[PDB]
């Protein structure tokens, strides 16, 4: 996307989950490093338009298989490390935060469709695992992020 005057590019995350107490862990492709979803917003879209993209595009899913359960109001922000700025600089991403319930089959997941996929692939696991596995300084993002949509994953798995 296209960087706001503080240096943070407008992002989208999603946190998709079963009624398992669960949620869609992802591999970042080619890598030993595990994420949620997550994808620029374009000029001209929402945020919830590039979410639906990003759901399409690197899940393969349609509005119609999930249900929107939550999002977060305001923007998460986290800086990226020194030595992975490139030189308007981005300094980092703003992201707004998706629930997602997935609604139709597991086989409809399809991660493989980009030629350069985001992912390589994915599994189910537990609520808050994602917290301690993703990068370092995504964590802060993800603590809020999971300590905001607890509440309604873990209604659905009772
Ligand atoms: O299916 C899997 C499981 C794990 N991994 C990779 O293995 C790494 C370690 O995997 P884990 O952190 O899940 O398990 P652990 O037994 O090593 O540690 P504890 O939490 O139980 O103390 C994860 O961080 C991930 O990079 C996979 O790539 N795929
Ligand atoms: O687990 C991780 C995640 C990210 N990184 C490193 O951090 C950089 C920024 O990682 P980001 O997740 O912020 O963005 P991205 O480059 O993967 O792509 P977009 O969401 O912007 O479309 C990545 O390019 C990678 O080099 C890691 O080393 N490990």
Redesign the pocket.
């Known amino acids: 996307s296209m960087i706001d005057d503080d240096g943070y590019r407008p992002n989208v995350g999603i946190v998709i989950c079963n009624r398992q107490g669960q949620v869609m862990w992802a591999?970042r492709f080619g890598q030993?490093?595990?994420q949620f979803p997550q994808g620029g917003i374009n000029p001209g879209e929402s945020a919830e338009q590039a979410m639906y993209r990003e759901l399409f595009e690197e899940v393969g899913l349609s509005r119609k298989d999930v249900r929107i359960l939550a999002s977060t109001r305001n923007w998460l922000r986290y800086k990226l490390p020194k030595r992975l700025v490139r030189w308007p600089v981005c300094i980092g991403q703003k992201q707004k935060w998706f629930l997602l319930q997935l609604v139709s089959g597991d086989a409809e997941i399809n991660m493989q469709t980009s030629s350069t996929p985001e992912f390589d692939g994915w599994?189910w696991v537990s609520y808050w695992?994602p917290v301690?596995?993703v990068v370092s300084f995504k964590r802060d993002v993800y603590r809020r992020v999971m300590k905001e949509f607890a509440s309604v994953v873990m209604s659905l798995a009772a």
Do not use: E, G
Request: hydrophobic content about 10%; overall charge positive; proline content about 0%.
């Open positions: 591999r030993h490093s595990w599994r695992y301690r596995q």
